[PDB]
């Protein structure tokens, strides 16, 4: 039940979008494996792909023993280019 994937390398509507995906991820109490990892990347990359990114390299670091939950999975993004920055470089 207690599941909250951590995001890294986002801001504004980017970090918010990935957050939405983070919630839709299979982390709703499943078997995290090479396949789960992909579902996460696709999720972020998908939402990230619609907010200025195309295929941000997003890695992860799973930690079965979270601090305030049941299972935590870290997610760091690193694409390169972004569309419509406006401010905050």
UniProtKB/Swiss-Prot annotation:
Similarity remark: Belongs to the TamA family.
Quaternary assembly: Interacts with TamB to form the translocation and assembly module (TAM).
Subcellular location per the Swiss-Prot or TrEMBL entry: Cell outer membrane
Consequence of gene loss (knockout): Not essential, cells grow more slowly than wild-type. No changes in permeability or outer membrane integrity. Loss of cell aggregation when adhesins are over-expressed in a double tamA-tamB deletion mutant.
Free-text comment about domains: Contains 3 N-terminal periplasmic polypeptide transport-associated (POTRA) domains and a C-terminal 16-stranded beta-barrel transmembrane region. The 3 POTRA domains seem to form a rigid body (unlike BamA where the 5 POTRA domains are able to move independently). Upon substrate binding (Ag43, AC P39180) the 3 POTRA domains move away from the inner surface of the outer membrane by about 30 Angstroms, which would deform either the outer membrane or TamB and may provide force to reset TAM. POTRA1 is required for interaction with TamB.
Gene this chain is encoded by: tamA
Covered residues, full protein: 22 to 102 of 577
Residue ranges of the region described as POTRA1, required for interaction with TamB: 1-81
Protein name listed in UniProt: Translocation and assembly module subunit TamA
Superkingdom field: Bacteria
Function of the molecule: Component of the translocation and assembly module (TAM), which facilitates the insertion and assembly of specific beta-barrel proteins into the outer membrane. Promotes the assembly and secretion across the outer membrane of a subset of autotransporters, such as Ag43. Involved in the assembly of the outer membrane usher protein FimD. In vitro, when TAM is reconstituted into preformed liposomes, it can promote the assembly of several outer membrane proteins, including OmpA, EspP, Ag43 and FadL.
Organism encoding this protein: Escherichia coli (strain K12)
